[PDB]
Protein backbone atom coordinates (compact mmCIF):
# COMPACT_ATOMS: atom_id res chain seq x y z
CA UNK A 1 0.00 0.00 0.00
CA UNK A 2 1.78 3.13 -1.43
CA UNK A 3 2.48 6.50 0.35
CA UNK A 4 -0.07 8.17 -2.03
CA UNK A 5 -2.74 5.52 -1.10
CA UNK A 6 -2.05 6.33 2.64
CA UNK A 7 -2.29 10.15 1.98
CA UNK A 8 -5.63 9.70 0.11
CA UNK A 9 -6.97 7.28 2.81
CA UNK A 10 -5.99 9.74 5.63
CA UNK A 11 -7.54 12.75 3.78
CA UNK A 12 -10.84 10.83 3.26
CA UNK A 13 -10.73 9.80 7.01
CA UNK A 14 -10.01 13.46 8.09
CA UNK A 15 -13.10 14.79 6.15
CA UNK A 16 -15.33 11.89 7.43
CA UNK A 17 -14.26 12.30 11.13
CA UNK A 18 -14.64 16.17 10.79
CA UNK A 19 -18.30 15.71 9.57
CA UNK A 20 -18.93 13.32 12.58
CA UNK A 21 -17.51 15.99 15.03
CA UNK A 22 -19.94 18.60 13.54
CA UNK A 23 -23.01 16.21 13.76
CA UNK A 24 -22.42 14.33 17.13
CA UNK A 25 -21.64 10.84 15.59
CA UNK A 26 -24.65 10.94 13.12
CA UNK A 27 -23.58 8.72 10.12
CA UNK A 28 -26.78 9.81 8.20
CA UNK A 29 -25.30 13.38 7.68
CA UNK A 30 -21.88 11.97 6.51
CA UNK A 31 -23.07 9.30 3.98
CA UNK A 32 -21.03 10.50 0.91
CA UNK A 33 -17.86 11.06 3.05
CA UNK A 34 -18.31 7.54 4.64
CA UNK A 35 -18.57 6.17 1.02
CA UNK A 36 -15.31 8.00 -0.04
CA UNK A 37 -13.61 6.71 3.20
CA UNK A 38 -14.53 3.06 2.31
CA UNK A 39 -13.50 3.68 -1.39
CA UNK A 40 -10.18 5.38 -0.33
CA UNK A 41 -8.99 2.99 2.48
CA UNK A 42 -7.99 -0.72 2.71
CA UNK A 43 -10.65 -2.92 4.45
CA UNK A 44 -8.39 -3.47 7.54
CA UNK A 45 -7.66 0.33 7.84
CA UNK A 46 -11.47 1.04 7.82
CA UNK A 47 -11.90 -1.50 10.70
CA UNK A 48 -8.87 0.04 12.55
CA UNK A 49 -10.25 3.65 12.32
CA UNK A 50 -13.91 2.71 13.16
CA UNK A 51 -12.72 0.84 16.34
CA UNK A 52 -10.26 3.69 17.26
CA UNK A 53 -13.09 6.28 16.91
CA UNK A 54 -15.36 4.21 19.30
CA UNK A 55 -12.56 3.77 21.92
CA UNK A 56 -11.70 7.54 21.86
CA UNK A 57 -15.35 8.87 22.01
CA UNK A 58 -16.29 6.34 24.81
CA UNK A 59 -13.06 7.05 26.81
CA UNK A 60 -14.09 10.78 26.80
CA UNK A 61 -17.54 9.99 28.36
CA UNK A 62 -16.09 7.42 30.86
CA UNK A 63 -13.73 10.31 31.89
CA UNK A 64 -16.41 13.11 31.62
CA UNK B 1 13.06 2.77 4.88
CA UNK B 2 14.00 6.43 4.07
CA UNK B 3 12.55 7.35 0.58
CA UNK B 4 16.03 7.53 -1.11
CA UNK B 5 17.06 4.26 0.65
CA UNK B 6 14.06 2.33 -0.84
CA UNK B 7 14.68 4.09 -4.23
CA UNK B 8 18.44 3.16 -4.29
CA UNK B 9 17.62 -0.55 -3.48
CA UNK B 10 14.98 -0.54 -6.30
CA UNK B 11 17.62 0.97 -8.70
CA UNK B 12 20.18 -1.67 -7.49
CA UNK B 13 17.67 -4.49 -8.42
CA UNK B 14 17.11 -2.84 -11.88
CA UNK B 15 20.96 -2.76 -12.37
CA UNK B 16 21.36 -6.47 -11.35
CA UNK B 17 18.28 -7.51 -13.49
CA UNK B 18 19.26 -5.55 -16.69
CA UNK B 19 16.53 -2.83 -16.18
CA UNK B 20 13.74 -5.54 -16.12
CA UNK B 21 11.05 -4.11 -13.73
CA UNK B 22 9.19 -7.53 -13.66
CA UNK B 23 12.12 -8.89 -11.51
CA UNK B 24 11.87 -5.99 -8.97
CA UNK B 25 8.12 -5.90 -8.04
CA UNK B 26 8.71 -6.40 -4.25
CA UNK B 27 11.31 -3.55 -4.13
CA UNK B 28 9.03 -1.39 -6.41
CA UNK B 29 6.33 -1.70 -3.63
CA UNK B 30 8.71 -0.61 -0.77
CA UNK B 31 9.83 2.35 -3.02
CA UNK B 32 6.15 3.34 -3.69
CA UNK B 33 5.43 2.82 0.08
CA UNK B 34 8.50 5.00 1.10
CA UNK B 35 8.12 7.99 -1.37
CA UNK B 36 5.41 10.56 -2.29
CA UNK B 37 4.06 9.94 -5.86
CA UNK B 38 5.41 13.41 -7.00
CA UNK B 39 9.00 12.31 -6.05
CA UNK B 40 8.54 8.85 -7.71
CA UNK B 41 7.51 10.60 -11.01
CA UNK B 42 10.69 12.76 -10.80
CA UNK B 43 12.88 9.69 -9.86
CA UNK B 44 11.48 7.53 -12.74
CA UNK B 45 12.34 10.36 -15.27
CA UNK B 46 15.90 10.85 -13.83
CA UNK B 47 16.54 7.03 -13.96
CA UNK B 48 15.07 6.59 -17.51
CA UNK B 49 17.19 9.55 -18.79
CA UNK B 50 20.46 8.59 -16.97
CA UNK B 51 20.23 4.83 -17.86
CA UNK B 52 19.51 5.85 -21.52
CA UNK B 53 22.47 8.36 -21.48
CA UNK B 54 24.65 5.47 -20.06
CA UNK B 55 23.94 3.16 -23.10
CA UNK B 56 24.12 6.04 -25.72
CA UNK C 1 5.89 5.60 10.94
CA UNK C 2 2.79 6.45 8.76
CA UNK C 3 2.66 10.29 8.34
CA UNK C 4 -0.94 10.62 9.73
CA UNK C 5 -0.20 8.23 12.67
CA UNK C 6 2.73 10.46 13.82
CA UNK C 7 0.54 13.59 13.23
CA UNK C 8 -2.36 12.07 15.33
CA UNK C 9 0.09 11.15 18.21
CA UNK C 10 1.54 14.73 18.17
CA UNK C 11 -2.07 16.12 18.15
CA UNK C 12 -3.11 13.68 20.98
CA UNK C 13 -0.19 15.09 23.11
CA UNK C 14 -1.29 18.72 22.31
CA UNK C 15 -4.85 17.86 23.57
CA UNK C 16 -3.50 16.22 26.80
CA UNK C 17 -1.36 19.32 27.72
CA UNK C 18 -3.78 22.30 27.17
CA UNK C 19 -2.52 22.78 23.51
CA UNK C 20 0.98 23.39 25.10
CA UNK C 21 3.53 22.59 22.29
CA UNK C 22 6.58 22.70 24.71
CA UNK C 23 5.55 19.31 26.30
CA UNK C 24 5.19 17.52 22.90
CA UNK C 25 8.62 18.38 21.35
CA UNK C 26 9.57 14.64 21.10
CA UNK C 27 6.47 13.66 19.03
CA UNK C 28 6.86 16.95 17.00
CA UNK C 29 10.27 15.54 15.85
CA UNK C 30 8.67 12.15 14.83
CA UNK C 31 5.83 14.12 13.05
CA UNK C 32 8.45 16.18 11.09
CA UNK C 33 10.41 12.89 10.35
CA UNK C 34 7.23 11.06 9.10
CA UNK C 35 5.61 13.85 6.93
CA UNK C 36 6.81 15.96 3.96
CA UNK C 37 7.03 19.70 4.96
CA UNK C 38 4.23 20.73 2.46
CA UNK C 39 1.83 18.30 4.31
CA UNK C 40 3.00 19.59 7.77
CA UNK C 41 2.20 23.23 6.69
CA UNK C 42 -1.35 22.19 5.63
CA UNK C 43 -1.86 20.01 8.80
CA UNK C 44 -0.62 22.91 11.07
CA UNK C 45 -3.16 25.32 9.37
CA UNK C 46 -5.98 22.67 9.75
CA UNK C 47 -5.17 22.20 13.51
CA UNK C 48 -4.92 26.00 14.23
CA UNK C 49 -8.31 26.61 12.47
CA UNK C 50 -10.19 23.61 14.05
CA UNK C 51 -8.84 24.19 17.64
CA UNK C 52 -9.82 27.92 17.28
CA UNK C 53 -13.32 26.97 15.93
CA UNK C 54 -13.70 24.70 19.08
CA UNK C 55 -13.47 27.85 21.33
CA UNK C 56 -15.31 30.31 18.93
CA UNK C 57 -18.56 28.25 19.46
CA UNK C 58 -17.90 26.43 22.83
CA UNK D 1 16.92 12.75 13.86
CA UNK D 2 16.50 14.80 10.63
CA UNK D 3 12.97 15.73 9.35
CA UNK D 4 11.65 14.24 6.05
CA UNK D 5 12.46 17.57 4.25
CA UNK D 6 16.10 17.46 5.57
CA UNK D 7 16.51 13.84 4.31
CA UNK D 8 15.00 14.91 0.90
CA UNK D 9 17.40 17.93 0.59
CA UNK D 10 20.40 15.73 1.71
CA UNK D 11 19.43 13.10 -0.94
CA UNK D 12 19.12 15.72 -3.77
CA UNK D 13 22.54 17.25 -2.86
CA UNK D 14 24.07 13.69 -2.66
CA UNK D 15 22.44 12.71 -6.04
CA UNK D 16 23.94 15.73 -7.89
CA UNK D 17 27.38 15.14 -6.22
CA UNK D 18 27.46 11.36 -7.09
CA UNK D 19 26.27 12.26 -10.67
CA UNK D 20 29.29 14.66 -11.04
CA UNK D 21 31.70 11.92 -9.73
CA UNK D 22 30.20 9.51 -12.41
CA UNK D 23 30.84 12.11 -15.20
CA UNK D 24 34.52 12.60 -14.02
CA UNK D 25 35.39 8.94 -13.00
CA UNK D 26 35.64 9.74 -9.20
CA UNK D 27 37.82 12.92 -9.78
CA UNK D 28 36.90 14.92 -6.59
CA UNK D 29 38.56 18.20 -7.83
CA UNK D 30 35.94 18.81 -10.62
CA UNK D 31 32.95 18.53 -8.13
CA UNK D 32 34.21 20.69 -5.17
CA UNK D 33 31.11 23.02 -5.48
CA UNK D 34 28.70 20.01 -5.32
CA UNK D 35 30.85 18.42 -2.52
CA UNK D 36 30.31 21.63 -0.41
CA UNK D 37 26.51 21.56 -1.15
CA UNK D 38 26.45 17.82 -0.06
CA UNK D 39 28.24 18.56 3.31
CA UNK D 40 25.99 21.57 4.27
CA UNK D 41 22.77 19.71 3.14
CA UNK D 42 23.51 16.42 5.04
CA UNK D 43 24.05 15.62 8.77
CA UNK D 44 27.66 14.65 9.71
CA UNK D 45 26.78 10.90 10.16
CA UNK D 46 24.95 10.89 6.74
CA UNK D 47 28.09 12.36 4.98
CA UNK D 48 30.23 9.56 6.56
CA UNK D 49 27.65 6.85 5.56
CA UNK D 50 27.42 7.98 1.88
CA UNK D 51 31.25 8.47 1.60
CA UNK D 52 31.89 4.86 2.88
CA UNK D 53 28.93 3.50 0.82
CA UNK D 54 30.40 5.20 -2.33
CA UNK D 55 33.90 3.65 -1.67
CA UNK D 56 32.42 0.13 -1.00
CA UNK D 57 30.28 0.27 -4.23
CA UNK D 58 33.08 1.66 -6.55
CA UNK D 59 35.72 -0.83 -5.19
CA UNK D 60 33.15 -3.73 -5.34
CA UNK D 61 32.62 -2.91 -9.08
CA UNK D 62 36.44 -2.99 -9.78
CA UNK D 63 36.93 -6.22 -7.69
CA UNK D 64 34.25 -7.96 -9.89
CA UNK D 65 35.13 -6.53 -13.38
Author numbering:
A (entry chain D): 50 to 113
B (entry chain C): 56 to 111
C (entry chain A): 56 to 113
D (entry chain B): 49 to 113
Mind quoting what the paper says about this structure?
The human assembly factor Coa6 participates in the biogenesis of the CuA site in complex IV (cytochrome c oxidase, COX). Coa6 is a soluble IMS protein with a CX9C–CX10C sequence motif, which binds Cu(I) with a KD(CuI) of ∼10−17 M. Coa6 deletion in both yeast and human cells results in diminished COX assembly and activity; however, this defect can be partially rescued by exogenous copper supplementation and in yeast by treatment with elesclomol (via a proposed elesclomol–copper complex). Here, we present the crystal structures of human Coa6 and the pathogenic W59CCoa6-mutant protein. These structures show that Coa6 has a 3-helical bundle structure, with the first 2 helices tethered by disulfide bonds, one of which likely provides the copper-binding site. Patients with mutations in Coa6 suffer from mitochondrial disease due to complex IV deficiency.
Finally, we determined and refined the crystal structure of the pathogenic mutant protein W59CCoa6 to 2.2 Å resolution by X-ray crystallography. The structure of W59CCoa6 shows four molecules (A, B, C, and D) per asymmetric unit. The noncovalent dimer observed in the WTCoa6 structure is maintained for W59CCoa6 (between molecules A [cyan] and B [gray]) through contacts along Helix α3 from each monomer. In addition, each of these molecules form a covalent dimer with another molecule of W59CCoa6 through a disulfide bond between the introduced residue Cys59 on each chain (covalent dimers between molecules A/D, [cyan and salmon] and B/C [gray and gold], Fig 4B). In this way, the asymmetric unit is composed of a dimer of dimers (a noncovalent dimer of disulfide bridged dimers). The superposition of the WTCoa6 structure with the noncovalent A/B dimer of W59CCoa6 yields a r.m.s.d. value of 1.2 Å for 113 common Cα atoms. These minor structural differences originate from a slightly different association between the monomers in the dimers, rather than specific structural rearrangements. Importantly, in the WTCoa6 and W59CCoa6 structures, the positions of the proposed Cys58–Cys90 Cu(I)-binding sites are identical. Under reducing conditions, the elution profile for the W59CCoa6 protein was identical to that of WTCoa6, corresponding to a dimeric protein. These observations agree with the crystal structure described here, which shows that W59CCoa6 oligomerization is mediated by the presence of intermolecular disulfide bonds that bridge noncovalent W59CCoa6 dimers. Oligomerization of the protein, through the creation of intermolecular disulfide bonds may inhibit or eliminate targeted protein–protein interactions between Coa6 and proteins such as Sco1, Sco2, and COX2, which are critical for its function.
